[PDB]
Amino acid sequence: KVFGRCELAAAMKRHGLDNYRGYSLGNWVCAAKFESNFNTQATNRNTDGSTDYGILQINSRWWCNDGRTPGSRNLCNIPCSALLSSDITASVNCAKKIVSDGNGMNAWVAWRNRCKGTDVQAWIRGCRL
């Protein structure tokens, strides 16, 4: 499913991402836009052999099980296919764990290089909040 901008903002808010660990809702919408272009089924293979999955590009190296990433962990305790659903609940729960692991939203390279320091409030502008 490819989400609209205000549709994902509403979904993220409902699931308690707004201001989670001090990150405003626009920071999460910005990270989705550049990681997946709002597409729940996005997949991308890394050079190390791991794969990033879903609207927030979660890594099978540490967080989910895809069966082909040797030496990896499964800290969110889910199959990586569960991150590819139309319902974002599984992605959001895993994201909450990632952002608390001690480097904040720096864990997302697209956030660090493209969202961090910018006017993120622009992403949620015009949505009924």
PDB file of C-alpha atoms in Angstrom:
ATOM      1  CA  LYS A   1       0.000   0.000   0.000  1.00  0.00           C
ATOM      2  CA  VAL A   2       1.335   3.447  -0.933  1.00  0.00           C
ATOM      3  CA  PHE A   3       0.138   5.924   1.737  1.00  0.00           C
ATOM      4  CA  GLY A   4      -0.816   9.539   1.286  1.00  0.00           C
ATOM      5  CA  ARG A   5       1.223  12.061   3.328  1.00  0.00           C
ATOM      6  CA  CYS A   6      -1.655  12.985   5.696  1.00  0.00           C
ATOM      7  CA  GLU A   7      -2.895   9.383   5.837  1.00  0.00           C
ATOM      8  CA  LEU A   8       0.489   8.171   7.240  1.00  0.00           C
ATOM      9  CA  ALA A   9       0.701  11.157   9.667  1.00  0.00           C
ATOM     10  CA  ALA A  10      -2.683  10.171  11.084  1.00  0.00           C
ATOM     11  CA  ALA A  11      -1.712   6.493  11.379  1.00  0.00           C
ATOM     12  CA  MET A  12       1.608   7.303  13.050  1.00  0.00           C
ATOM     13  CA  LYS A  13      -0.168   9.584  15.572  1.00  0.00           C
ATOM     14  CA  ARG A  14      -2.830   6.972  16.381  1.00  0.00           C
ATOM     15  CA  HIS A  15      -0.038   4.425  17.158  1.00  0.00           C
ATOM     16  CA  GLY A  16       1.764   6.839  19.563  1.00  0.00           C
ATOM     17  CA  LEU A  17       4.824   7.908  17.466  1.00  0.00           C
ATOM     18  CA  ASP A  18       4.149  11.654  17.874  1.00  0.00           C
ATOM     19  CA  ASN A  19       6.807  12.953  20.346  1.00  0.00           C
ATOM     20  CA  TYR A  20       8.062   9.412  21.091  1.00  0.00           C
ATOM     21  CA  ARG A  21      11.546   9.796  22.759  1.00  0.00           C
ATOM     22  CA  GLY A  22      11.207  13.547  21.994  1.00  0.00           C
ATOM     23  CA  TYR A  23      10.904  13.209  18.151  1.00  0.00           C
ATOM     24  CA  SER A  24       8.039  15.316  16.668  1.00  0.00           C
ATOM     25  CA  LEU A  25       5.592  13.692  14.202  1.00  0.00           C
ATOM     26  CA  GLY A  26       7.134  15.531  11.207  1.00  0.00           C
ATOM     27  CA  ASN A  27      10.494  13.763  11.944  1.00  0.00           C
ATOM     28  CA  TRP A  28       8.806  10.363  11.512  1.00  0.00           C
ATOM     29  CA  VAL A  29       6.919  11.352   8.306  1.00  0.00           C
ATOM     30  CA  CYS A  30      10.157  12.804   6.830  1.00  0.00           C
ATOM     31  CA  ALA A  31      12.011   9.489   7.611  1.00  0.00           C
ATOM     32  CA  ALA A  32       9.252   7.441   5.896  1.00  0.00           C
ATOM     33  CA  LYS A  33       9.231   9.655   2.773  1.00  0.00           C
ATOM     34  CA  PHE A  34      12.996   9.214   2.128  1.00  0.00           C
ATOM     35  CA  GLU A  35      13.304   5.575   3.339  1.00  0.00           C
ATOM     36  CA  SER A  36      10.343   4.046   1.413  1.00  0.00           C
ATOM     37  CA  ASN A  37       8.522   6.882  -0.438  1.00  0.00           C
ATOM     38  CA  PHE A  38       5.497   5.907   1.798  1.00  0.00           C
ATOM     39  CA  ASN A  39       5.331   2.327   0.255  1.00  0.00           C
ATOM     40  CA  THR A  40       4.681  -0.485   2.869  1.00  0.00           C
ATOM     41  CA  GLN A  41       6.113  -3.189   0.489  1.00  0.00           C
ATOM     42  CA  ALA A  42       9.530  -1.524  -0.133  1.00  0.00           C
ATOM     43  CA  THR A  43      12.575  -3.868   0.174  1.00  0.00           C
ATOM     44  CA  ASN A  44      16.297  -2.986  -0.350  1.00  0.00           C
ATOM     45  CA  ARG A  45      19.392  -5.280  -0.085  1.00  0.00           C
ATOM     46  CA  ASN A  46      22.517  -3.984   1.773  1.00  0.00           C
ATOM     47  CA  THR A  47      26.154  -4.771   0.747  1.00  0.00           C
ATOM     48  CA  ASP A  48      26.622  -6.900   3.908  1.00  0.00           C
ATOM     49  CA  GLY A  49      23.837  -9.258   2.691  1.00  0.00           C
ATOM     50  CA  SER A  50      21.141  -7.972   5.101  1.00  0.00           C
ATOM     51  CA  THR A  51      17.846  -6.445   3.830  1.00  0.00           C
ATOM     52  CA  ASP A  52      15.861  -3.402   4.961  1.00  0.00           C
ATOM     53  CA  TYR A  53      12.037  -3.890   5.070  1.00  0.00           C
ATOM     54  CA  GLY A  54       8.838  -1.798   5.137  1.00  0.00           C
ATOM     55  CA  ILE A  55       7.824   1.859   5.364  1.00  0.00           C
ATOM     56  CA  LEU A  56      10.664   2.531   7.873  1.00  0.00           C
ATOM     57  CA  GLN A  57      13.324   0.239   6.234  1.00  0.00           C
ATOM     58  CA  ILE A  58      14.031  -1.925   9.362  1.00  0.00           C
ATOM     59  CA  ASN A  59      17.260  -4.048   9.036  1.00  0.00           C
ATOM     60  CA  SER A  60      17.234  -7.881   9.188  1.00  0.00           C
ATOM     61  CA  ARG A  61      20.753  -7.662  10.704  1.00  0.00           C
ATOM     62  CA  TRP A  62      19.506  -6.910  14.207  1.00  0.00           C
ATOM     63  CA  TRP A  63      15.701  -6.444  14.345  1.00  0.00           C
ATOM     64  CA  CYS A  64      13.723  -9.073  12.313  1.00  0.00           C
ATOM     65  CA  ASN A  65      14.202 -12.633  10.855  1.00  0.00           C
ATOM     66  CA  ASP A  66      14.270 -13.111   6.989  1.00  0.00           C
ATOM     67  CA  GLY A  67      16.038 -16.518   7.108  1.00  0.00           C
ATOM     68  CA  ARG A  68      19.004 -15.523   4.883  1.00  0.00           C
ATOM     69  CA  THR A  69      21.022 -13.054   7.049  1.00  0.00           C
ATOM     70  CA  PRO A  70      23.792 -15.182   8.706  1.00  0.00           C
ATOM     71  CA  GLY A  71      24.899 -14.205  12.243  1.00  0.00           C
ATOM     72  CA  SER A  72      22.008 -11.699  12.640  1.00  0.00           C
ATOM     73  CA  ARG A  73      19.649 -11.224  15.661  1.00  0.00           C
ATOM     74  CA  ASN A  74      15.823 -11.015  15.949  1.00  0.00           C
ATOM     75  CA  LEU A  75      15.357  -8.403  18.750  1.00  0.00           C
ATOM     76  CA  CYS A  76      11.786  -7.353  17.682  1.00  0.00           C
ATOM     77  CA  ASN A  77      10.768 -11.077  17.573  1.00  0.00           C
ATOM     78  CA  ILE A  78       8.895 -10.935  14.181  1.00  0.00           C
ATOM     79  CA  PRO A  79       9.335 -12.279  10.613  1.00  0.00           C
ATOM     80  CA  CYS A  80      10.569  -9.515   8.296  1.00  0.00           C
ATOM     81  CA  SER A  81       7.503 -10.206   6.087  1.00  0.00           C
ATOM     82  CA  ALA A  82       5.296  -8.796   8.953  1.00  0.00           C
ATOM     83  CA  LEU A  83       6.928  -5.381   8.330  1.00  0.00           C
ATOM     84  CA  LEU A  84       5.521  -5.361   4.770  1.00  0.00           C
ATOM     85  CA  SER A  85       1.781  -5.258   5.689  1.00  0.00           C
ATOM     86  CA  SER A  86      -0.839  -2.527   4.861  1.00  0.00           C
ATOM     87  CA  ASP A  87      -1.253  -2.090   8.675  1.00  0.00           C
ATOM     88  CA  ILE A  88       1.838  -0.323  10.123  1.00  0.00           C
ATOM     89  CA  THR A  89       1.429  -1.580  13.736  1.00  0.00           C
ATOM     90  CA  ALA A  90       4.356  -4.053  13.464  1.00  0.00           C
ATOM     91  CA  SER A  91       6.676  -1.423  11.893  1.00  0.00           C
ATOM     92  CA  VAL A  92       5.790   1.158  14.539  1.00  0.00           C
ATOM     93  CA  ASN A  93       6.432  -1.192  17.508  1.00  0.00           C
ATOM     94  CA  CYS A  94       9.854  -2.136  16.121  1.00  0.00           C
ATOM     95  CA  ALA A  95      10.704   1.546  15.367  1.00  0.00           C
ATOM     96  CA  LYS A  96       9.956   2.412  19.005  1.00  0.00           C
ATOM     97  CA  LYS A  97      12.530  -0.189  20.100  1.00  0.00           C
ATOM     98  CA  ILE A  98      15.162   1.028  17.598  1.00  0.00           C
ATOM     99  CA  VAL A  99      14.904   4.740  18.560  1.00  0.00           C
ATOM    100  CA  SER A 100      15.351   3.834  22.267  1.00  0.00           C
ATOM    101  CA  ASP A 101      18.602   1.809  21.681  1.00  0.00           C
ATOM    102  CA  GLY A 102      20.890   4.797  22.518  1.00  0.00           C
ATOM    103  CA  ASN A 103      21.625   6.626  19.187  1.00  0.00           C
ATOM    104  CA  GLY A 104      18.055   8.038  18.750  1.00  0.00           C
ATOM    105  CA  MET A 105      16.881   8.558  15.133  1.00  0.00           C
ATOM    106  CA  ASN A 106      20.562   8.453  13.997  1.00  0.00           C
ATOM    107  CA  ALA A 107      19.899   4.727  13.449  1.00  0.00           C
ATOM    108  CA  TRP A 108      18.151   5.825  10.159  1.00  0.00           C
ATOM    109  CA  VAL A 109      20.868   7.120   7.764  1.00  0.00           C
ATOM    110  CA  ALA A 110      18.243   8.806   5.520  1.00  0.00           C
ATOM    111  CA  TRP A 111      16.949  10.699   8.587  1.00  0.00           C
ATOM    112  CA  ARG A 112      20.512  11.798   9.568  1.00  0.00           C
ATOM    113  CA  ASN A 113      21.543  12.929   6.053  1.00  0.00           C
ATOM    114  CA  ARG A 114      18.124  14.384   4.837  1.00  0.00           C
ATOM    115  CA  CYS A 115      15.791  15.286   7.766  1.00  0.00           C
ATOM    116  CA  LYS A 116      17.942  16.167  10.854  1.00  0.00           C
ATOM    117  CA  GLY A 117      18.129  19.922  11.505  1.00  0.00           C
ATOM    118  CA  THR A 118      15.557  20.793   8.758  1.00  0.00           C
ATOM    119  CA  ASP A 119      12.004  22.266   9.033  1.00  0.00           C
ATOM    120  CA  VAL A 120      10.297  18.880   9.619  1.00  0.00           C
ATOM    121  CA  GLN A 121       7.017  20.541  10.694  1.00  0.00           C
ATOM    122  CA  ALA A 122       6.442  21.169   6.924  1.00  0.00           C
ATOM    123  CA  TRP A 123       5.688  17.424   6.425  1.00  0.00           C
ATOM    124  CA  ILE A 124       2.541  17.463   8.621  1.00  0.00           C
ATOM    125  CA  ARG A 125       1.338  20.905   7.388  1.00  0.00           C
ATOM    126  CA  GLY A 126      -2.312  20.932   6.222  1.00  0.00           C
ATOM    127  CA  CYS A 127      -3.305  17.609   7.885  1.00  0.00           C
ATOM    128  CA  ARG A 128      -6.298  17.503  10.289  1.00  0.00           C
ATOM    129  CA  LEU A 129      -4.561  16.892  13.668  1.00  0.00           C
TER     130      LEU A 129
END
